[PDB]
Each structure stands twice: as C-alpha cells, then as structure tokens.
RNA sequence: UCGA
C-alpha cells in the first residue's frame, strides 16, 4: 500500500492518541477540595455521522462525528457518583481515500518534517580562537537546555536569558559534591569549580532566582525551577525523547517519558567534557536519523492538548463560584473552546492544504508530500543553502528529483516508493540480506531505520546477479559512512530491493529515466500531475508497469472484494453476489465536479456473468484506463522544423486531433448566488425582473431559476434576483426624462447572477438549498442556489501541452491533414516537434520512447520497460533497434526500418509532394494536456471597479482588474523618451476621480485635452504624513509671495 | 584530509616520533616533524564495557566460546534479596516486622486510610502513604484517642 | 563523451567518476551523484534572482 | 541484542532469591564469549585500562614456505612488491612472526606527511574505519 | 500553493 502515513496515523489517533490525552487531563480538583472530575477516555462512543460523503460536498458541510465520553462526577465528603455522557466536540473523520472534507471541500494534511527531540552537540568557532563545544537538549514540548563551553575550562548553562555557571543548576536540582565527581574526568571540572564558588543545597536556589527573575525567596527558587523541567503538563520529552536519551548518552533507565531525570543532566555534562578529550561524536542537524516526521495522529494530539487546557480554566471557574450541590456534570464541560480548536486546525491552519485533484497521480502525490514548513518547523526567510540541498542520508527515503521549482526549491519534498515510517517517526527502507556474496531473496526485508551509515555496507539495486549462485560482478560499488566506494562482493551486507527505490511514485512513470537529465526529469514529474482527464484515455505503449499500482491506491477505482459472479451491469451500478443478504451494490459516480474544475466520471468495465478476484478492476476512473493509469494519448510525432511554427518550444499539431475528440476534456464549473436579508427589505428570487425582456427569460420556469439541460452562453441570467433600494436622490436630468415618457422607476434593483465573459456550457445540476427542508443555512440568507455548468472543451491554439520528459510547449497552429507531412504508406503526421530543444537539454529518453512506441505500434504488444538497467549498450540501443527490425520483417511493412539510417525513415512533404533531403525520426509519442488552457489566461479591462482608499483600479481576472505597471516598467519608459506616455499611465488611467472623467469624455467627443490634475495617491500620502506630526506642505516660489498651496481643496 | 583505516588490530610505528607543541590555538595537538610510516596489524577487536575487568593476561591462549571478560558486580550493604516478578535485581539491607500486625481499610467516614487494628485493642491510623519517602525521626502512624 | 567528475553538496569532488553519458545510460549509483549538482544548480538560481 | 563488533554477552546470576547475602560479595556475573580462538595480544601495561581486546585468529596469519633460502630478520617489516630471493615474489605486506615455513602476520602501512597532527597512540587498538591521522597540505 |  502506498498510503500508510495517513491511514496508520489516523488509526493510531483513534485508539492510542485520543486515550492518552484524556488520561493526562483527568483528574481535576477544586480550590477547596469539595468535588473532583475525572473522565473515562477509553470508553468513548464516536457515534454515526449526519450526512453522506457526496452529500457533504454539495450541502457545504463537513463529514464529522459527535464525540461523547462517560463522565463520573464524584464528591469528597458526600458519597455520590454522577455518571453522565457529555458532548465533547466535533471531529471530522478520514474518508476511504485518506482525506478529510472541510466545508464541502476535500482537504489533506501534509506531513511536516521537524527535528527529533534529544541532545545534540556541535563544534562552534565564534571567532579566530579556541575550539568551543556546545549542546542542546531539545524536548518534545517545554524549555530548552543549552550547555556551552568557553575557553580555559568553563562550562556554562543557558536556560534566551544570560548564561550561568554549571554548578548553579547542578546543585539546585538536588545533588552532593561526591555524587557528581564519581560519574564524571574530574580534572577538567576543577577549572569551572574554582571561579564559581562551592554552593550548598540551599546556597544555589537564591542566586538562581536573582538572575532569572531580577527580592529572592527560598520558596520562589524551587517553584521556578520545578515548573520548567519537573512539572507535569508543562514539560514533555515524548516517547521518542526517552529513546534518543538512552541511545546517545547510553543510559540504563527507561520508560520515564514525563519528568526530566536529574541524572540525565549529569550525563549531558559528562559527554560535553569528553568532547575536548577527542572522544565522542558530533551530531548533524540535516541527518535523517535526527529528523522526524509527524502526521495526523500527532498533529491532532497537540490541538486537543491546547484545547483541553482552555477547558481546564472554565472547569475550575465553575466549581468555585457555585458553592451549592446537586449540579449535573454535563454543564461543567463547555465544548465551545474545543470545537473552535479543531476547526482552526482543519480550516485555518497552514499545514491543512487544498487538495489537488486534477488526475489520480496528483492525488497520490499530495498525500505523500514532506514539507519542512509549518507552526514549529522552518521559515521562508530562515531557509538556507544547507537545508535545501540533498543529504547523503536521503538515499531511498526522500525523492531527490521531485521537488517544486521556484521559491519552495527543496523545502517541499516527496516520499520515495518503498519508504515507510515507523511508530517513532523515522523513514525506513527495505533491504535484502547478502550472505557470502549471495543475495538472500527468500525471506522478508530488514527495513533499516537509517542505521546503515556507520555500521553496514549497502549496495544499490543495479549490480548483475546470478540465479541463486553468486554475484556476477567482481567490483561492487557501495556506500559506507556517506561515501561511495567499490569493495569486494563478499564484504557487503545489504542490497536494495528495487531500482526505483530512490525515485518517487511520480518519477517512476517516466520511461528511460537514466537517459534524461535530472533537471528535465524534475519538470517531467511536475507536468504529469497537471494532466487533465480526457474523454477517452489510452494506455501508454512504453509504460513502466507501475501505473497499475498507482490507480488502485488512488481510491477512484472500484475493486472487487468477494470473488463472486457479476449479475447486472449498467451505467450507474454493478451488482455481484458473494460466495465461497448476498447482493451488494457498487455505486458509480457520473460527471462529478472536482476541486480543479475537472470531471470524476467512472465507467463500467466488467460484463454480466464473469468470475472476479479480490483486487480486480470493476470500474475505472476518469484518467484511468483498464487496469493501468492513462493520462494522455499515443499519436505520431516527427522531429522536423516547420515554417517557423515550432521556432522556440512551440508545437504544431494537425486537424485530426480535433475531430477525433483527442485531448478533449470535460470541465464542470460551479456558480453561487444567495438571497440575503437586506435591512431595507427582504430579497427574493423572481422572474419578472426590470429592464430585461424575453431575450433572457427563455430558460426560467416562472421561479427565477434556470432549468436542467439549458444551453447557456456568455451574458445570460442563471438566477434572477432583485434588491430593494431607498435612495430617492434622482438628478434633475433623469427627473425630466422620466416625466416625458412616463414609466416611473420601481424600488427594486436587478442583482441577477450572470455568466462571466468567455464562459459557456450545459447546465447539469440546479440544486437549490433553502430553509425548512432539513439542511442548515448560514445566517443572513433565505435561499441558497447552486448551479453546476458542464462544458466540453476541445484542443485549440494556445493550449499548453507536454510529455513525460519535460518537453512542454504551446500550440500555435492547427494545420489540416493535407498540409502535414505523410509517411510512405500515406499516413499523415500528427505532431511536428522541433529537434533543436533535444540536444541542448539532454532529453535523450524521449527519442528512445518514440522509437520504441513506434515498434509497439506496428506489432501491437504494449511494452513494459522498467528503468535503471542489464548489459551496457545492449539494453537500450539494441532493444529499440532490435525490435524495430522485427517489425520490418513483416511482408506488408518494409519501410519501417532502414539499414543506413536506423532510427529514421523518409518523410514526404504534404504541400508539394516532394521528399525531404534528409530522413526524419518518426515515432509514437505520449503527450499530455495540461491545465494551463488558453481560456483561463484571457483578461481585458476598459473601465471597471476601483480601490477603496487609493481609488486605483483593482487586480484580478474574476473581478475585472487592471494590469500592474510596477517600478521596473517605469524605468523602461524613463530610459525612453516617453514622458507623455508615463504621465498618462499615472494620472488619467489610475487614481484620479476628475482626470478619468475628462479623459473618457474626450475620446467619445473626439477632442483630447492635455494637463491632467494631481493624482489621488499623492494626496493620501500628504494627509498621512501630517498625521505623523510632520508639517509638510507645498509652496510657490513666485515673486514676493510664499504661500502654501491647497492640493486637496 | 581525514585518513581512515581499513583493518583493525595493533598500531605499529616506523620512523615517526611525536611532539608536544602545545600553544593557545586548540591546546590539544601532536605534530610529527618527520612523518614516516604507521602500520596496523591484523586481528579481531572486541570492545569491552567500562565496568568490566579483563581476566585474560598477555600471551594466553583462548578457546572457542570460552570466557574473555567477567564483570564484577558487587553490591555492598545488603543482607536479604527479594524479587517476585521483575527485571532488575534489588537488595534489602534491613527489614522490620512487628508482631500481631493486622491492617484494615475501614474508612467509611472520609478519605480511605488503612487503620491498623493491633491485638492490644488499639486503632492506629496510617499517616504515611504508600509511595513517598521517609526520613529520620518522621511520623509513620498516629493512633485515634477517644479521650 | 564522458560526464566528468561531479562534487558533493558541500563541494568535495568525489573520486568515483561517471564514465557513461546520457546515450549509454547512467546507473543508480551515477544518478544520485548527478542529482547533487542538479539540486545545487536549482537552489542557486532562485537566490540569484 | 549485542553489536557485531562487541561479541557474545551472557547473563548469569550467582545467587538466587531469598538468601543471606553477605555485604561485599558478588551478585551477578556477566561474562563475554569469544567468537574465534587464537592468542590474546595488545595487553595494556597500566592498570584500570580495559576498553577492547585483540583476538588474532588463524586466518590473520599467512604462511609462506619458500624452498630456496629463508632470509628474514626478527622485527623486520616486509612490504609486498619486493623479492627476497630471485625466483619468488610477495603478495601481502606485514610483519614476520617466526624465523622453514615463514609465517607472515598481515598488515597495511600508511604514509604520514611531516607536520601532520595524529589522533592515535603507539600500542593501542583500533576498529574498522576510525580516524587515525589528519594530514595537512597546501592547495 | 501553482505558472514564467
């Protein structure tokens, strides 16, 4: 299973994470001691949800459950036990795909990588001086212990504040002079004991309080130090903090997990002194053995911990004011601070991200992202060069290729294919045991938790092995202590289980990965997660074979579980019968809206009367073919330059891709309107709207709302809504115009929902959610109407297409089939790609892919080639050229392979009919269609809305915004002679309530006027500087007159 | 440049003498004015715990599966050992057991305390708690007095 | 031709060379060494702008 | 479980539960077993110095029986690559144990540049892959 | 977060 960091994490929270939080919260007491409240956390209910999975997405709700615990309220003096179940909070459940539904939108919880708790030592040179060793005891939650060591044998303890001597903390926790020196070399400790005095057990708590809290008190020094490291519910090492203390310092005690042991502070000082004696290891901060990951089971444990602490303040403020008895325990627990704590984590936190649902490849990748940012991780400004590079401990755990380019280059990683996280939070990799030069591929792997660095010798999965005898190679390259070396095959210990263990699940879909560059393989893995689901997908011919596993783990593929006989198959359900209440129904969704405006259509695959197996595809998804995944189409390609139509990364396609419904996707948009409550009068949805005739009232059913199946275009009316007005401030021009022809204006105003510019399609869902029907509504709303419009988009000029090797491009021309070049059998060419971008970017694998897919086209065999071989030069060139020779041995196909030029044939011109001078490489390429279509990039504005303060035009496609003329754009016009264009762009086009009126009136009348006025943004800055206490004004230097000018008035 | 070894065993020197040029740079240095050759002999090396003692002296033959190092674990000031189900051993140096000791948890009035009902018609309340420390001249019990 | 001698993420030149190229195909050992310079050349571009 | 470089550690108790142990006596006795037999070498002269033990196995000594003339000196270090007598060569460097079958204990020399700081002493025991010297150079 |  590829999703185990989400399913096993939420399963741990429902049985171990929720029980541990309620056991530490209980019991609580009052100020006097009259009654006590303790919970029973291990007997909670977790009742049934309210709505369905598909119903919660359209009703704008969350798939959540109610949490109830039994609560026993006892009293100290009077014997009474009050058992009652009290509501705790709303907990959203994880769906079957591993996601959550928050406010009708599907969301994921990205796993965040942080540092592991423990002690870490570091050699630091602050200046050109001696060698200083530092320390840092990091807990899971609480204060930090930073031990430093200066020159001349002075070890200090810093607990944010100023540093202090090591004897001050070591004596205040409770110790003797003989219990320190017996377990310490004590000759180095005499230099820090001379210039520190010699305090007793009570002569150190007073001096500790004088420097931390600057009167000292004998009772104040004990309450300050115990609350930092020794008090419960304020300092936590964690289950993994106790494990890292017993490994580094080699401690004998274990299973403490709550209180910091004072013997552990003595062991951290002893390891720091011995670092000057050239013994001990300096820890690394970028090592994956020191870096942990956490998931939904751990991140939810911190939100209930800060949510129950707010509940502890109200539970102690209600058992003291009410001095009377006979009170119910259900009124002591207020669920309001804990409901708002869970709702803030799932909807308002940064780590809960919007789920990418373009294709099943992006859904599987987004659940396995390893990001180093979040509330407790790193910062965008605090990220440096060392944290973004690849550590040598990332071999097989984190993918070195798949990472987003730009700002987050290296901070957001991806988990590898065979990687696995244990219960402690460390990434593990499987390895096969090698015994005396023989790979023992018979038993289960070892799953080493990054402990193979300083102990084991690990070989990758690329060495030639024999059939159970020995290893063929005499020099095996291995890795030992983060360095590569070639040793004997009898000296190795472990070997990798797969050659795709290093790369992730999205990089493994690229065939011939070893022939492509690592920079273009980064782009090829990112463009595969943006491919739209087509209308009829097609499986690739040069697939790697891992597409079948990624389709079943995405959750959008109906699988069988019963091993039965299929009875009834239609377009909505599949009914089988289980055998060794026997009729289950598998529902099939038809054209459901996704998050990225794509389709989630499922098609039936099986027929009636067929034996099935557990793990068989019953119904494939939208971007999924039969069994395996399918994100694009296999069509003909040719690497030849046309007449400037493929000049700089441009694509020339044919007309055959248009009328054959190739690269044709279905996009479903969703519109929203609401009949709110205006204080002047309630708004309602009517059909008789003013100033709109029969040109737009054709699809309404006398209710103001459109019908199902009506073709809407740009500028129509979906929901006709009116709004009452109470202005009554008519100008004298409109009063004279209305008095002539009559037709007195009504009190309503047309606020109908309309279709935006460049939008069309067919309406498929006109679901209306009103009150008194069984659904909750937001306050200040009478009727909520939701309109879903689906449209069928073909492939056009301006769309961005790409392949699996980073050869992205934008189509500039769609030629007919008689103008495209044609093969010597008469078959035309679909895509005419440019061969100039190939040798400059090292995209060699895309030439191996098309030449192998052309061999699979004439044979019809659908090759499955795994990456990272076999014999050198005999597995990539002679595989392609050897299989192209077999396709040429057919009696009908003799023109496929040539002896002089192997990977080339003769191509004829379509316009003139003459052959070209040189042979051209042809093949069957697998191209994808990305989400960056030409329809979403069109924006234009003449005059629209304006800003609130600066009175400048707004910015945005969805709100009719204007393009920003920034500071780099002024410097280009200032370097030109364009002074009148610069004054026009800053005055009459932005921030002038007077200059915009006269400039617009000049074009309609036909006589332009010069000299625009003062812009509004300068007068805002003039009033802001006067409010800062600065007498700033503008004057005139005219003859015998120095007067201030009034820019505002 | 870090130079790591390949085999394990005894270190032998050839035409190399150490020098102690102690200065204020790092205060732990040892340079060689004439760097010759250093040799590493062969043999299996097995590390010992810091609390163990080597019972095998020099020029002694060992067998397969024999004894190499015996750890001396001596816990003084203790006379009686007692363990039922545990992992770490525990030694007890002093134990007391009074005659006619019969405690009972008859505390229906307030909090639960173990009242010691001795044979001398006396009821002693257990003032001490199970789990806390006791010191010299401390209170462990207090009898209830009707007068 | 030959790929050459790549370096560490810190800058140390590894003594193991990459004798293959993009036509013969790299190995799994020669792919993680080439990824050290591809990540270094990627994060140096964003800080250059 | 113990590591591969540690060995085989056993747990044994000298006394049982419920006895009269005198003060100042042994309670537990944990011994360390040996994997391969041989001759223990590298004993420390000073007391209270027990960190690691050497066990020279039978595979650590290579025996070479030349029939022409045994020409070796006690305490001489033989480097592989040279010829003792004309008619035979060498294959493994190391030190000589006995002065007709000359047995050779295997070793590997390391050249140290003058002026370099070293982190090893004369006569101690090393592990497989530890830092020994720190060669300094100008570039 | 994602494109150049």
């Amino acid at each position: 299973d590829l999703i185990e960091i989400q399913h096993a994490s939420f399963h741990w929270f429902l049985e171990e994470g929720l029980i541990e939080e309620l056991n530490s919260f209980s019991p609580i007491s009052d100020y006097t001691g009259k009654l006590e409240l303790h919970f029973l956390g291990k007997d909670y209910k977790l009742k049934q949800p309210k709505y369905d999975v598909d119903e919660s997405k359209r009703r704008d709700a969350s798939y959540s459950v109610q949490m109830y615990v039994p609560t026993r309220l006892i009293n100290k003096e009077t014997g009474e036990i009050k058992e009652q179940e009290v509501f705790i909070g709303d907990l959203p459940l994880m769906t079957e795909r591993g996601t959550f539904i928050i406010n009708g939108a599907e969301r994921v919880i990205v796993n965040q990588i942080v540092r592991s708790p423990g002690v870490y030592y570091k050699k630091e040179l602050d200046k050109n001086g001696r060698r200083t060793y530092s320390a840092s005891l990091i807990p899971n939650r609480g204060a930090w212990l930073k031990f430093e060591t200066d020159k001349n044998g002075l070890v200090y303890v810093r607990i944010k504040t100023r540093k202090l001597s090591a004897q001050v903390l070591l004596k205040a926790i409770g110790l003797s002079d003989n219990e320190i020196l017996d377990s310490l070399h004590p000759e180095f400790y005499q230099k820090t004991l001379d210039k520190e005095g010699n305090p007793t057990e009570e002569e150190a708590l007073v001096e500790l309080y004088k420097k931390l809290r600057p009167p000292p008190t004998v009772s104040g020094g004990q309450q300050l130090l115990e609350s930092r490291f020794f008090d419960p519910k304020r300092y936590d090492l964690g289950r993994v903090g106790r494990y890292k203390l017993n490994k580094k310092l080699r401690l004998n005690e274990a299973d403490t997990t709550r209180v910091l042991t004072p013997q552990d502070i003595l062991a951290a000082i002893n390891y720091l002194i011995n670092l000057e004696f050239d013994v001990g290891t300096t820890d690394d901060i970028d090592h994956l053995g020191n870096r942990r990951v956490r998931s939904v089971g751990e991140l939810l444990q911190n939100q209930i911990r800060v949510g129950l602490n707010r509940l502890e303040r109200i539970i102690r403020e209600r058992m003291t004011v009410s001095e009377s008895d006979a009170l119910t325990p259900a009124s002591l627990v207020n669920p309001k601070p804990l409901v708002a704590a869970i709702k803030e984590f799932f909807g308002s936190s940064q780590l809960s991200q919007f789920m990418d649902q373009t294709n099943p490849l992006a859904e599987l990748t987004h659940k396995r992202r390893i990001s180093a940012l979040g509330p407790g991780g790193l910062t965008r400004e605090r990220a440096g060069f060392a944290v973004r590079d690849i550590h040598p401990s990332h071999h097989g755990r984190i993918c070195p290729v798949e990472t987003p380019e730009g700002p987050n280059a290296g901070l957001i990683g991806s988990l590898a294919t065979c990687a696995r996280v244990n219960d402690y939070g460390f990434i593990e990799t499987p390895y096969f045991r090698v015994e005396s030069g023989r790979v023992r591929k018979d038993l289960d792997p070892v799953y080493l938790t990054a402990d193979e660095e300083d102990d084991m010798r690990v070989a990758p999965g690329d060495i030639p092995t024999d059939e159970e005898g020995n290893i063929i190679g005499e020099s095996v390259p291995i890795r030992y202590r983060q360095e590569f070396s070639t040793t004997s095959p009898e000296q190795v210990d472990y070997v990798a289980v797969s050659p795709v263990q290093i790369i992730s699940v999205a990089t493994s879909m690229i065939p011939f990965l070893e022939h492509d560059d690592a920079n273009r393989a980064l782009m090829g893995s990112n463009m595969q997660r943006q491919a739209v689901p087509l209308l009829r997908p097609e499986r690739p011919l040069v697939g790697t074979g891992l597409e079948a596993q990624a389709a079943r783990d995405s959750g959008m593929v109906i699988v069988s579980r019963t091993h039965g006989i299929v009875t009834y198959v239609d377009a909505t359900e599949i009914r089988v019968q289980p055998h060794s209440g026997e009729e289950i129904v598998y529902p099939i969704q038809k054209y459901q809206r996704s998050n990225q405006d794509t389709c989630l259509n499922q098609r039936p695959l099986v027929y009636a009367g067929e034996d099935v197996v557990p793990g068989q595809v019953l119904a494939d998804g939208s971007a999924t073919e039969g069994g395996e995944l399918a994100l694009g189409q296999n069509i003909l390609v040719a690497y030849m330059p046309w007449e400037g139509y493929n000049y700089e990364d441009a694509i020339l396609i044919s007309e055959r891709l248009v009328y054959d419904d190739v690269y044709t996707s279905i996009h479903i948009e969703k519109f929203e309107i609401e009949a709110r409550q205006t204080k002047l009068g309630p708004e309602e949805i009517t059909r008789e709207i003013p100033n709109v005739g029969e040109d737009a009232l054709r699809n309404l059913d006398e209710h103001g709302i459109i019908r199902i199946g009506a073709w809407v275009e740009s500028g129509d009316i979906l929901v006709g809504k009116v709004t009452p007005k109470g202005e009554a401030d008519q100008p004298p021009e409109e009063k004279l115009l209305r008095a002539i022809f009559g037709e007195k204006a009504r009190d309503v105003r047309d606020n109908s929902l309309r279709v935006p510019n460049g939008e069309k399609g067919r309406v498929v869902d006109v679901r209306v959610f009103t009150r008194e029907k069984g659904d909750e509504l937001p306050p200040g709303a009478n009727m909520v109407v939701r309109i879903y419009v689906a449209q069928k988009r073909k492939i056009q000029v301006g769309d961005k297409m790409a392949g699996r090797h980073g050869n992205k491009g934008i189509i500039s021309r769609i030629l007919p089939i008689e103008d495209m070049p044609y093969l010597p059998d008469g078959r035309p060419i679909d895509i005419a790609l440019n061969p100039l971008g190939v040798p400059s970017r090292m995209n060699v694998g895309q030439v191996f892919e098309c030449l192998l897919g052309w061999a699979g086209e004439n044979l019809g065999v659908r090759f499955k080639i795994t990456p990272f071989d076999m014999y050198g030069e005999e597995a990539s060139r002679d595989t392609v050229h050897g299989l192209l020779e077999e396709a040429s041995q057919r009696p009908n196909k003799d023109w496929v392979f040539n002896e002089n030029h192997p990977g080339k044939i003769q191509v004829f011109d379509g316009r003139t009919g003459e052959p070209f001078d040189r042979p051209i490489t042809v093949g069957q390429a697998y191209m994808l269609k990305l989400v960056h279509l030409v329809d979403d990039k069109i924006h234009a504005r003449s005059t629209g809305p304006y800003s609130l303060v600066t009175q400048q035009p707004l910015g945005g496609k969805a709100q009719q915004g204007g393009q920003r003329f920034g500071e780099m754009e002024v410097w280009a016009l200032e370097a030109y002679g364009a002074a009148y264009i610069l004054q026009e762009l800053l005055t009459v086009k932005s921030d002038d309530m007077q200059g915009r009126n006269e400039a617009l009136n000049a074009i309609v009348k036909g006589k332009s006027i010069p000299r625009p006025g003062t812009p509004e943004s300068f007068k805002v800055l003039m009033r802001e500087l006067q409010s800062l206490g600065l007498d700033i004004a503008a004057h005139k230097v005219q003859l015998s007159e120095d007067g201030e000018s009034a820019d505002a008035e | 440049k870090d130079v790591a070894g390949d085999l394990a065993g005894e270190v032998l020197f050839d035409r190399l003498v150490p020098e102690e040029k102690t200065d204020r740079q790092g205060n732990t240095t040892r340079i060689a004015q004439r760097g010759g050759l250093v040799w590493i002999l062969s043999g299996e090396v097995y590390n010992l715990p810091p609390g163990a003692e080597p019972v095998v002296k020099n020029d002694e033959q060992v067998e397969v599966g024999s004894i190499m190092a015996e750890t001396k674990l001596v816990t003084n000031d203790g006379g009686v050992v007692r363990l039922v189900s545990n992992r770490e051993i525990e030694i007890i140096t002093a134990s007391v057991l009074l005659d006619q000791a019969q405690v009972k948890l008859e505390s229906s009035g307030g909090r639960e305390q173990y009242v010691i009902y001795t044979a001398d018609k006396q009821r002693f309340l257990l003032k001490a708690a199970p789990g806390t420390k006791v010191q010299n001249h401390s209170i462990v019990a207090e009898l209830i007095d009707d007068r | 031709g030959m790929r050459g001698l790549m370096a560490d993420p810190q800058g140390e030149i590894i003594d193991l060379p990459i004798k293959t190229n993009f036509r013969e195909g790299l190995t799994v050992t020669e792919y993680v060494i080439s990824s050290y310079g591809a990540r270094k050349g990627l994060v140096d571009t964003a800080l250059r702008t | 479980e113990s590591d591969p470089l540690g060995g085989a550690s056993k747990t044994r108790l000298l006394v049982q539960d419920g006895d009269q142990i005198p003060p100042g006596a042994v309670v537990a006795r944990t011994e360390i077993q040996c994997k391969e037999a041989g001759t223990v070498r590298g004993i420390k002269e000073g007391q209270e110095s027990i960190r690691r033990v050497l066990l020279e196995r039978a595979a650590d000594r290579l025996v070479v029986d030349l029939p022409s003339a045994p020409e070796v000196k006690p305490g001489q270090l033989l480097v592989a690559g040279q010829e003792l007598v004309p008619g035979v060569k060498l294959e493994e460097s190391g030190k000589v144990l006995e002065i007709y079958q000359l047995v050779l204990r295997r070793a590997r020399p390391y050249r140290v540049s003058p002026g370099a700081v070293l982190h090893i002493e004369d006569g101690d025991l090393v592990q497989r892959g530890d830092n020994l010297v720190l060669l300094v150079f100008e570039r």
Side-chain angles (χ1 to χ4, degrees), chain A residues 638-709:
Chain A
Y639 291 93
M640 43 169 306
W642 204 242
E643 311 271 345
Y645 287 106
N646 46 3
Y647 162 67
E648 213 164 356
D649 272 8
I651 307 183
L652 179 66
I653 69 160
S654 89
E655 265 190 20
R656 199 205 63 89
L657 308 182
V658 178
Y659 48 75
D660 279 17
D661 293 337
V662 192
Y663 304 113
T664 297
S665 44
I666 302 175
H667 300 264
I668 307 177
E669 42 269 39
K670 158 191 159 180
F671 301 99
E672 180 68 27
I673 207 63
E674 211 168 72
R676 304 179 180 273
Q677 214 278 338
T678 294
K679 65 212 191 313
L680 196 142
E683 305 176 5
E684 69 155 349
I685 297 175
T686 75
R687 188 204 165 102
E688 282 84 56
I689 58 171
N691 314 281
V692 171
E694 216 55 48
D695 53 328
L697 259 67
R698 295 178 287 107
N699 304 280
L700 308 180
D701 50 355
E702 301 279 356
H703 280 264
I705 325 171
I706 53 173
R707 310 189 189 95
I708 322 176

Side-chain angles (χ1 to χ4, degrees), chain B residues 40-52 54-56 61-62 64-66 69-71 73-81 83:
Chain B
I40 299 176
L41 276 302
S42 199
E44 278 84 17
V45 181
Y46 297 97
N47 40 50
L48 274 77
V55 305
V56 180
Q61 300 283 338
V62 79
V64 183
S66 183
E70 314 185 276
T71 316
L73 191 147
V74 175
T75 79
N76 44 307
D77 206 349
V80 176
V81 55
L83 189 145

